[model samples]
Target chain A: VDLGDISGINASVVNIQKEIDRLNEVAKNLNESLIDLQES
Target chain B: MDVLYENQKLIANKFNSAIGKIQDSLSSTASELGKLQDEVNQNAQDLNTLVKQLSSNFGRISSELNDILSRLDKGEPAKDLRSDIDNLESKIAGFNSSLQKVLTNLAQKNQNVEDKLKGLESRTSSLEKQIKGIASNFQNEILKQREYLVNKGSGNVLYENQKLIENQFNSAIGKIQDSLSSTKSALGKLKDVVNQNKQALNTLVKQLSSNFGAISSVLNDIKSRLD
Candidate 1:
């Protein structure tokens, strides 16, 4: 069962997913804010 | 005395044979799980690299757009900023393809892991059944042996030996099951995370599409102002 310490793998994957979500949000907000600044 | 000794010897041999096979099966399964873990690690690292690249590109693009806005306010021509934007747009286009490739790769990797996990699950279940069947047969054999030795002087001794064998067998099976359960749980977590990433990637691609449009409009607005 010591070999079952593969939680490290899961953690890496979860972190990657979080990063992707953050990147997506940043891209969304940046575009929206840029356009809004132009409109103003 | 001879009968008891002979029966015990036969039972011991049966235990050895059954446990041996179980050990082999478990060892093989552990190796496969290790390989799968390696594959998952590689896939995750690839994703990490791509995400960082995207972060760098977007940050640069944002910086240049900010410069354009600042210069335009001072009645300065923004040729340099415009040129950078063009280059960044090309990079973004490249990222679109890069993301597409990642999505495809992730999906394929997920499929392979899914298939492997299913096979492992089935294999573990079969091993469990084999253990049960073997245990059952051993129990019956011991019971018959117990019946013959019950009235004999060796009944108590044989009974104790039977308990010892049963405990060893139970302990071995329990450990194997525990290992298998942990493996299954870890892999399930991996699959869930991978699935979420795929969905997130899909959402990111869509956002990138809209962001592309938004950037184009902003660029056009700047162009019109300069004209």
Candidate 2:
């Protein structure tokens, strides 16, 4: 979803959520890469 | 296997750097928010002070206006009172003008008064003196001549004196007559000045009121953000 007019406190909250989402995605991707490496 | 290990190490290094960068950004943002919070707090306090001051000023003005209104209600001619009202209004206008200058300076702006009132007050005073002089001169000169003719009790001299007095009275009245149109024009100019000052004062008050609202909103927004 596109964040509109989000700034200050609201923006900070959204940014934290975005950071956590990114971390989760990166971690899952890294795990999949690790599994691929092991299989190879 | 070695290639896989090297790729994993590279990914780990990049991830760590990215996390560090995010942390730095968050810290900077937090610092900025702190600064904004302080500024907002300062603005709120300033606005509070301004509201109190404006309220007090308006109260004083209302009281003074009531006193003037009471005097007017007690059968004072509006024409006679116009100068006093104009003087008082001009003083208020001057105060507002200074206030506007201070506000504009604060806002980094400038202003000029168009259609300036040139010598309006002096002109009004001159008119007042001329009118009073006409009244006084007629009483002293014309009436005195009439009284002399009545008391002298010589018919021929009385007739001659009456004719002379009439001519003299007409001449003096003529000079006074010339003042009529010019006096009216001067009075009209004075009225325009008074109206202009009223308009200027109203504009300043409106701007001040709007600024109060804007400053309050900005402060409130900052406060909520910081909270």
Candidate 3:
């Protein structure tokens, strides 16, 4: 196992995590906006 | 009018700042998706090559996601939007697994966990930094929510010289803001899981690092341990 491949994959997962958090923010925004739509 | 406009601006800007590079990675991986989508096309390739390709493509996918995220500002008007943005969120939700699958695929291709150990330590360090940064920002910004909702920490709320609780619409906005703020608890739970995994990883890395020694006698012990 090359050390480099291990690092690459690991970095990739961390980035995925960051990506997921951002998506969750958008999802929360979307959720709130939908609630507004329903009430209005 | 100014309130919603100002709040929406911050929302859009943060989405871009936060989602920027992520979108880039996801889009870049698009070039490889056609082949990867087939799932049966990799039989002729070696595991090592697969690992490298998977590494690069996975990196690209996360970067490519920002473009799609950028479209949020231009999303449909209220009536047409509920289903539309819901679909968008759902689409982005699917990507979590695609990345998780890459982790699984790598474990299958590689035998020793040793190769992953060092990188896991470093990346978790990076995650630690990001998570801590969030803690500091959230502490300051959570109460700075003047654009919407009640400011709990500020010790005062609900009024302006011009008008504050002037109508039912603004009243509804306050409730919505309260609801949105409540959702942070769910995020806290998500972070709880991340922290638990991180703590576990930290112990493992610390144990590994402490076990290694440069002394000739200890080096012999290490080599035997590795063997």
Candidate 4:
């Protein structure tokens, strides 16, 4: 099959799963921030 | 004359080296920060990048993450994170290209700064050699002392000015040392700013990741209630 808009685009990702991984990291950091706030 | 020229070059060398180090450090720091920022911004953009491969065959995934938040209150799965199968190698290429440009650009500019410094060093080298060879090339006429042999004291007067030039060169070195100290203070203060930003970024990324699991669960609970 022919790939389209599949290359030449920077910052575009093919996998939805990998995007989720970055989101997961962000959420994890947010958790720690909240924990610190609560403790303080 | 040679001694003063050497002293001047010595300080110039130190200043050039210090400035180069600062540029290198700045470029590296900027490169890293650019990646983190682009990565985050790209994450925000991921939903819309997906192409609908098919409806009946490939299935549909929604790219609207923000819209998901509101829809969650109404008790629906916000969106499918992935809509269709993708080519893996192409995706990797896209990912690297997105982030690599920032570093590449910074490094080029960094090289340019060092290039300019090298140019200055070359000019100073030329000047120092003249300062060394003042006895031979009096033909330049720009540098010849006034021929005041008519005044017997003029020769002695010239000797007196030599000490003055010596002190001026010493003062130039002193200024260089002063700036190196100032740089240390500036560097320490800059670190404080970076530390503050570090804390800020940490909290931000943490929120993005940490709250997701909680929100997703909450979303699931609401979905269950509605159903």
Give the top-scoring candidate (lDDT): 1
* Residue pairs in clash, model 1: none
Q: Give the per-residue Cα lDDT of candidate 1 at B99.
A: 70
**Model 2 ranges with Cα > 4 A deviation:** A1-40, B75-87, B105-227
lDDT, candidate 2, A1-40, per-residue tens: 1111101110000012333233334333322222111211
Error of 1 at B21 (Å): 1.4
lDDT tens digits, residue span A1-40, model 1: 0111111122155323332233233323322211000000
lDDT of 4 by residue, B106-217 (tens): 3344344335434433543453354335313322221232242234352354433433333433443343334334333433333343344334333433432333344345
Could you give candidate 2's per-residue lDDT for residues B111-220 as a string of tens digits?
12112223433443564465566446544644544553454444454435445444544443443333333334433443443344334444545655664454345334
Instruction: Report, for every candidate in turn, its global Cα lDDT versus the true structure.
Output: 0.58, 0.41, 0.35, 0.34
Fraction of true A-B contacts recovered by candidate 1: 0.04
- B1-227 per-residue lDDT for model 3 (tens digits): 45544543453345335433333432333222222212211321333354455446434433333332343345534434344444544543464446446545544433222233334334434643663464346334434545464433332323231122123223333433442343333233334433443443344333323322222233233234322
Q: What is the TM-score of chain B alone in each candidate?
A: 0.70, 0.42, 0.24, 0.33
- Cα lDDT tens digits, model 1, B1-227, are 45666667777666766655655565565566566666666766665566566556666666666677677778755676567657766776786677777768766875686678678667767876776788688767756765665654533665566555555555554554554565556556656765665565555556556656666676667667765
Which scores better on DockQ, 1 or 4?
1
Ranking by DockQ: 3, 1, 4, 2
